[PDB]
Amino acid sequence: NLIETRCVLNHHSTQETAIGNFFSRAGLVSIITMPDGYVNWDIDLMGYAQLRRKCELFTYMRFDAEFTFVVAKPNGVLVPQLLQYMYVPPGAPKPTSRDSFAWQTATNPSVFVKMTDPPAQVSVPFMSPASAYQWFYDGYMMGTFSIRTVGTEKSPHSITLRVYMRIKHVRAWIPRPLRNQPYLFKTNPNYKGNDIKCTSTSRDKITT
Amino acid sequence: NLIETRCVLNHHSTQETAIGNFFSRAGLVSIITMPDGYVNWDIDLMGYAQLRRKCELFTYMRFDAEFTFVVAKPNGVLVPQLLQYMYVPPGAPKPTSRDSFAWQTATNPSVFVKMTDPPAQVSVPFMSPASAYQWFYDGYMMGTFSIRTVGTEKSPHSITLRVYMRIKHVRAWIPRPLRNQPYLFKTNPNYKGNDIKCTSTSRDKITT
Amino acid sequence: PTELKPGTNQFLTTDSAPILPGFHPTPPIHIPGEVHNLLEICRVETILEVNNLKTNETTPMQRLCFPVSVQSKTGELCAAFRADPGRDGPWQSTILGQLCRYYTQWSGSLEVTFMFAGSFMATGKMLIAYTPPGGNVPADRITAMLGTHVIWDFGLQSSVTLVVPWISNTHYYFDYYTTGIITIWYQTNYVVPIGAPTTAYIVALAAAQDNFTMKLCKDT
Amino acid sequence: PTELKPGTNQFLTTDSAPILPGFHPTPPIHIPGEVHNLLEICRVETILEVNNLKTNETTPMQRLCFPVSVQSKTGELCAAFRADPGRDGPWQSTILGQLCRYYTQWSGSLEVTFMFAGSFMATGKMLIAYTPPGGNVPADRITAMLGTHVIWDFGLQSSVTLVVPWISNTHYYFDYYTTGIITIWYQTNYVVPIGAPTTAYIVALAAAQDNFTMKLCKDT
Amino acid sequence: NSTITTQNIVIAYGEWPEYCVNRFFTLDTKSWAKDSKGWYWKFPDVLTEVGVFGQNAQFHYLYRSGFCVHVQCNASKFHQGALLVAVLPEYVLGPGQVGAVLTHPYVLDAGIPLSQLTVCPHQWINLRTNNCATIIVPYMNTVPFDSALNHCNFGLLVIPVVPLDFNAGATSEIPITVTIAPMCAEFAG
């Protein structure tokens, strides 16, 4: 129910419609829970729907990442417990067992933090062999995160952690029309052909 | 199963094939467990196999070290407990009892850290009497680490700790062919003479 | 000798050590069509969806243009809508309307471009009137003429642009919107010689002007 | 007055107080043969292992050279392999192939040097052809000649070098490899006067060029 | 060699083709009817089995070129209608030289609305005023060179936004002609 009063007469700053601010805010990308200790994730942007639509406005993007792992027991409480977060570059072996040699390899960086410390923070640079990422390939990855509780024992504490993404130094190319249909798969842009949702709403008559 | 597409046309930076980067990454060297309190270790590089092959490519090497002791109970959990890490130079008496005079000698540096603190970090300089280390002597050490729980009591907590090595200021001389046979002993380069593993794989015919 | 102040050991989402210090990323190359600001996107013509009738949902391809016919007398209203990019309605189908949902407050001037898509052997006259914000929809052609209007005829020119002076918003579930109403009037009946089709169509395009600007961000 | 930021009290393996401040290490001396970069190692000829047949595993000393005989007619293929230092096969036996396993991506140009090891009183002609990447192995000598080729004869010169223009890789368990195929053709039959041996051998050496370069590291 | 006759050009993103077989290839004429939905072509697929350009593209490994597309429609003064000609880099669906036909033109068969297609380099064809539309497309890819057998850079779209209408008695099949001229083509096979 719109109203008429309280008009605005001054122009706002244009620095805040820039491409950097449009992606500056950091948001959740995944939720990881551990009731097998490996929970190996996979860095991606086509995860939560609201980020797969704002990022598909362009075709080529180049940026960095900045993670933050907030980890606690399911009911909030924190306990003294050591943790290991492992990063697997695009082309390194992926862990398959809790006691595999990947957990002890040296070329894969890792961070060891207890629960009581402030959440760990890690920045990931641009890694694609090409000049920039592309969300649309007409022809015919960023890495891997593995989380494990350190120790040959079995940790008697359920683990739930959330990963947050921040995007820095964003460059975009070739703007593309925004998607207006529900998503079906995380890889290809398919749509339900049985029905088509009109972009706009509907009214009774063109004159009303 | 190789494929043909997605060729690369640009040359990469040569600064990252340098000798420093080849050893810059830090990796595990040993795992120490304590269910007698002394667990006196011995600093070495011919430990885990994957580091004994990358380091034997050269003959003379000179560098420093930077340790980091991550210590926790076998099942991850951390408890308040004081610890003592002792370094024995090459030529100082080695502890033989939990209550020996070595633990109280003054010329051997030590660090006292509880579990809850971030892992202790210690840098060890170049100590060999010669100009550089050598992995191959045709004729006929770096120190000693001792770990003990401080106190005349008996600590009721199992101790498991892992030691990580980083290498700084690396210089190499006289490159040597890489080893291609399984290792037998940690001191001499022996091989199983009953069979010899060919360096390359095998195919059916020279033309196929 | 420092003492920690309140605000330590806290994670603020709107506030790092690199993981691969020895990694050199691939140098960038020149790719045409770089976007430096979202405003350069909002300043392109896009097709308005004015004929958004209830019966057109089955066949949405007919929603992009509204018809003009020979069976209409002179003076009757043809179409009417308000200039509200943020709200629902015809403006939901434009890039400006789609990008207006990601921001809370915006202000500036818009522009609307119409296009005739009839036969070459066809002429007439049509009236475009913009009621200033706060007023009512005009009751008749003689009342709409007194306001701001342009006499658009398709006997000589096939396109015309109309400029909205100023709009603004302040989202709060209600918003303080100051917008006008755009009405299309039949100045003269659609005349046409023999052999040519009797009905035509009009395409409406809209885009922002130079002085458009948005404020605090949201998520749709 | 400072507040700690997120990322404290964490141990990053890719990120100290000296333990003996009063220790003075032994000053270095001049030792010949210092290596400043791994590329100076990859730029030396090494023996390729082309004759890697299944029956040669018992006696590996015969795998370093492939034979040329008098019982072979003109025109038939002698040997064939692709230029893939990273993958398994003949290139596993070279320093370049061994050092390629420690890195993910690499690109550059290679060079292959052949060497004749027959008797002095022996002459002939041999064809070396390099099929560009993406093509098929040549079906016959007349098809291989049309491409890039060098006519190597051992009547005057006993060695010849062939230059591969460009190769690249991007390891992912598969990799995007763009490589050609090197084939050795019998231009003329091995001729030899009386008294000399009837069979000879060829040694193949390979090394990288100036513009070779590698990327992100791994562990074999 | 081939010469065409023609009497407002648009340059995609304001960049001329520039280095890091030059003739007028004329494709087949598509028939526009009262119930047609649209057509689209993929580049450089449409010139893979055609003449010297296709002969060179099917052998050389690396490839890079611009394009110059010329689309014209022949109609009398008694037909009415409108067309939307626009390129779309990295067109992913949800064909060959003869082209294909769209099935859901409102969503471009890719889930994106047609009304916002004008953000891409586009030109309006209106049978009332003009019968020509030329677009200059530079090379748009993340690598300087790429193969021409699998990757399709961009796809051209022709959509009848305003359906064709006429009185009974005239020709019901209005032709549509597409003309193609590569600019600054390189091969490094």
PDB file of N, CA and C in Angstrom, chain E residues 3 15 17 21 29 31 54 58 60 76 79 92 94 102 110 117-118 128 141 154 159 165 170 172 176 184:
ATOM      1  N   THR E   3      29.875  -9.922 -54.358  1.00  0.00           N
ATOM      2  CA  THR E   3      29.461  -8.544 -54.140  1.00  0.00           C
ATOM      3  C   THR E   3      27.969  -8.500 -53.843  1.00  0.00           C
ATOM      4  N   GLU E  15      34.167  -1.818 -29.637  1.00  0.00           N
ATOM      5  CA  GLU E  15      35.513  -2.265 -29.969  1.00  0.00           C
ATOM      6  C   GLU E  15      35.518  -2.878 -31.361  1.00  0.00           C
ATOM      7  N   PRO E  17      37.163  -5.163 -34.415  1.00  0.00           N
ATOM      8  CA  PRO E  17      38.017  -6.356 -34.481  1.00  0.00           C
ATOM      9  C   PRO E  17      39.472  -5.965 -34.694  1.00  0.00           C
ATOM     10  N   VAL E  21      39.554 -15.681 -47.731  1.00  0.00           N
ATOM     11  CA  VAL E  21      38.653 -16.015 -46.632  1.00  0.00           C
ATOM     12  C   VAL E  21      37.855 -14.813 -46.143  1.00  0.00           C
ATOM     13  N   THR E  29      17.817 -18.474 -46.993  1.00  0.00           N
ATOM     14  CA  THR E  29      16.786 -17.522 -46.604  1.00  0.00           C
ATOM     15  C   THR E  29      15.676 -18.250 -45.858  1.00  0.00           C
ATOM     16  N   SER E  31      11.967 -18.530 -44.170  1.00  0.00           N
ATOM     17  CA  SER E  31      10.646 -18.038 -44.534  1.00  0.00           C
ATOM     18  C   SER E  31       9.898 -17.603 -43.280  1.00  0.00           C
ATOM     19  N   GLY E  54      35.477 -22.866 -43.662  1.00  0.00           N
ATOM     20  CA  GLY E  54      35.291 -24.148 -43.006  1.00  0.00           C
ATOM     21  C   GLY E  54      36.441 -25.103 -43.260  1.00  0.00           C
ATOM     22  N   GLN E  58      38.457 -26.623 -40.060  1.00  0.00           N
ATOM     23  CA  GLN E  58      38.421 -28.046 -39.746  1.00  0.00           C
ATOM     24  C   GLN E  58      39.805 -28.674 -39.635  1.00  0.00           C
ATOM     25  N   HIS E  60      43.146 -26.461 -38.924  1.00  0.00           N
ATOM     26  CA  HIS E  60      43.958 -25.736 -37.956  1.00  0.00           C
ATOM     27  C   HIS E  60      43.404 -25.917 -36.548  1.00  0.00           C
ATOM     28  N   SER E  76       6.995  -5.588 -48.893  1.00  0.00           N
ATOM     29  CA  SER E  76       6.342  -4.493 -49.595  1.00  0.00           C
ATOM     30  C   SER E  76       5.856  -3.463 -48.578  1.00  0.00           C
ATOM     31  N   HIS E  79       2.802  -4.955 -45.883  1.00  0.00           N
ATOM     32  CA  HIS E  79       3.059  -5.862 -44.776  1.00  0.00           C
ATOM     33  C   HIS E  79       3.503  -5.074 -43.551  1.00  0.00           C
ATOM     34  N   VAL E  92      23.659 -20.755 -24.000  1.00  0.00           N
ATOM     35  CA  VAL E  92      23.467 -22.120 -23.526  1.00  0.00           C
ATOM     36  C   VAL E  92      21.978 -22.428 -23.562  1.00  0.00           C
ATOM     37  N   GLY E  94      18.463 -25.040 -23.232  1.00  0.00           N
ATOM     38  CA  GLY E  94      17.863 -25.732 -22.107  1.00  0.00           C
ATOM     39  C   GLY E  94      17.097 -26.976 -22.513  1.00  0.00           C
ATOM     40  N   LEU E 102      13.200 -21.746 -32.487  1.00  0.00           N
ATOM     41  CA  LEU E 102      12.918 -21.701 -31.061  1.00  0.00           C
ATOM     42  C   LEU E 102      11.575 -22.354 -30.759  1.00  0.00           C
ATOM     43  N   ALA E 110      15.992 -20.604 -22.648  1.00  0.00           N
ATOM     44  CA  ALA E 110      17.086 -20.674 -21.690  1.00  0.00           C
ATOM     45  C   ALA E 110      16.696 -20.166 -20.307  1.00  0.00           C
ATOM     46  N   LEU E 117      16.337  -8.717 -23.482  1.00  0.00           N
ATOM     47  CA  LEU E 117      17.372  -9.081 -24.442  1.00  0.00           C
ATOM     48  C   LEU E 117      18.103  -7.866 -24.999  1.00  0.00           C
ATOM     49  N   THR E 118      17.521  -6.671 -24.879  1.00  0.00           N
ATOM     50  CA  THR E 118      18.104  -5.478 -25.479  1.00  0.00           C
ATOM     51  C   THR E 118      19.380  -5.015 -24.788  1.00  0.00           C
ATOM     52  N   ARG E 128       8.104  -1.025 -41.292  1.00  0.00           N
ATOM     53  CA  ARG E 128       7.551   0.263 -41.698  1.00  0.00           C
ATOM     54  C   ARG E 128       8.636   1.195 -42.226  1.00  0.00           C
ATOM     55  N   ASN E 141      36.321 -13.912 -25.716  1.00  0.00           N
ATOM     56  CA  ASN E 141      36.630 -15.169 -25.049  1.00  0.00           C
ATOM     57  C   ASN E 141      37.694 -14.908 -23.994  1.00  0.00           C
ATOM     58  N   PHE E 154      29.334 -17.147 -29.606  1.00  0.00           N
ATOM     59  CA  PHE E 154      28.093 -16.411 -29.421  1.00  0.00           C
ATOM     60  C   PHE E 154      27.029 -16.949 -30.364  1.00  0.00           C
ATOM     61  N   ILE E 159      13.987 -12.687 -33.575  1.00  0.00           N
ATOM     62  CA  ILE E 159      12.699 -13.001 -32.958  1.00  0.00           C
ATOM     63  C   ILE E 159      11.626 -12.030 -33.438  1.00  0.00           C
ATOM     64  N   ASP E 165       1.561  -9.465 -40.108  1.00  0.00           N
ATOM     65  CA  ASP E 165       0.156  -9.397 -40.477  1.00  0.00           C
ATOM     66  C   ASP E 165       0.027  -8.778 -41.860  1.00  0.00           C
ATOM     67  N   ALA E 170      -1.961 -11.300 -50.743  1.00  0.00           N
ATOM     68  CA  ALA E 170      -0.556 -11.005 -50.960  1.00  0.00           C
ATOM     69  C   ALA E 170       0.290 -12.223 -50.596  1.00  0.00           C
ATOM     70  N   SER E 172       2.405 -14.624 -48.537  1.00  0.00           N
ATOM     71  CA  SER E 172       2.363 -14.937 -47.117  1.00  0.00           C
ATOM     72  C   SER E 172       3.715 -15.346 -46.551  1.00  0.00           C
ATOM     73  N   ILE E 176      13.803 -13.844 -45.211  1.00  0.00           N
ATOM     74  CA  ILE E 176      14.781 -13.249 -44.308  1.00  0.00           C
ATOM     75  C   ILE E 176      16.156 -13.724 -44.753  1.00  0.00           C
ATOM     76  N   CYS E 184      39.375 -10.051 -39.626  1.00  0.00           N
ATOM     77  CA  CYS E 184      40.580 -10.302 -38.835  1.00  0.00           C
ATOM     78  C   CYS E 184      40.609 -11.740 -38.313  1.00  0.00           C
TER      79      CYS E 184
END
